[PDB]
Design a protein around this ligand. Structure first.
Ligand SMILES: [Ca+2]
Length: 223
């Protein structure tokens, strides 16, 4: 996350780190057995780590649970990152408490200028490299479709939205594919892509999870 602040430990309860030896993607816990992340984050041998703040020290509220199954969306296109969403099932169920919790799916799509919360462990610099060990947050608005599609001519589909500032310097990207964008209580997105990090007129782009609730709920009940 470039240009945000330290969330505070265990303040984003539904936040997950996917670990293949090292932190490589974020995700959201949606019930005790399932995680949603981005498809461009598929890896074999995923361990899911819940209740993290500092992903490098065991501070006492973590649960570490192996993934049993990953399900990338049927129509994910890794060239355009259309349909960038993936379901990850836990080998044993999480135990839900104050610091590990689910986040609700959408009944409806968020609209533009709704304030959202975007979290992750992502790169914090726009030029160069610095990764933080603790959870980071940014508060930003869902930008209008126009101002989204204008920054990426011919790249934005119905299944993405943009959030952040047109002006540049607050953004994630790097700084955590796969992580949550939560608005008015409900998971409305997944960090997908974005040219550079926090350039002027290069907002972050996010999977529009509202379009996928029917599939998430069907898939998760059959597996
Ligand atoms: Ca930890």
């Amino acid at each position: 996350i470039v240009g945000g602040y330290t969330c505070g430990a265990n303040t984003v309860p539904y936040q997950v780190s996917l670990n293949s030896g090292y932190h490589f993607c974020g995700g959201s816990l949606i019930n005790s057995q399932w995680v949603v992340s981005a498809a461009h984050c598929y890896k074999s041998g995923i361990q899911v780590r819940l209740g993290e703040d500092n992903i490098n020290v065991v501070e006492g509220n973590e649960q570490f649970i192996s993934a049993s199954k990953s399900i990338v969306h049927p129509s994910y296109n890794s060239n355009t990152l259309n349909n960038d969403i993936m379901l990850i099932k836990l080998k044993s169920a999480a135990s839900l408490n104050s610091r590990v919790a689910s986040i609700s799916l959408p009944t409806s799509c968020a609209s533009a200028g709704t304030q959202c919360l975007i979290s992750g462990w992502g790169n914090t610099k726009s030029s160069g490299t610095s990764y933080p060990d603790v959870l980071k947050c940014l508060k930003a608005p869902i930008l209008s479709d126009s101002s989204c599609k204008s920054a990426y001519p011919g790249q934005i589909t119905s299944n993405m939205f943009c959030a952040g500032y047109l002006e540049g310097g607050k953004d994630s990207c790097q700084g955590d594919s796969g992580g949550p964008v939560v608005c008015s209580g409900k998971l409305q997105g997944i960090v997908s892509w974005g040219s550079g990090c926090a350039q002027k007129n290069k907002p972050g782009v996010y999977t529009k999870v509202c379009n996928y609730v029917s599939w998430i709920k069907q898939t998760i009940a059959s597996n």
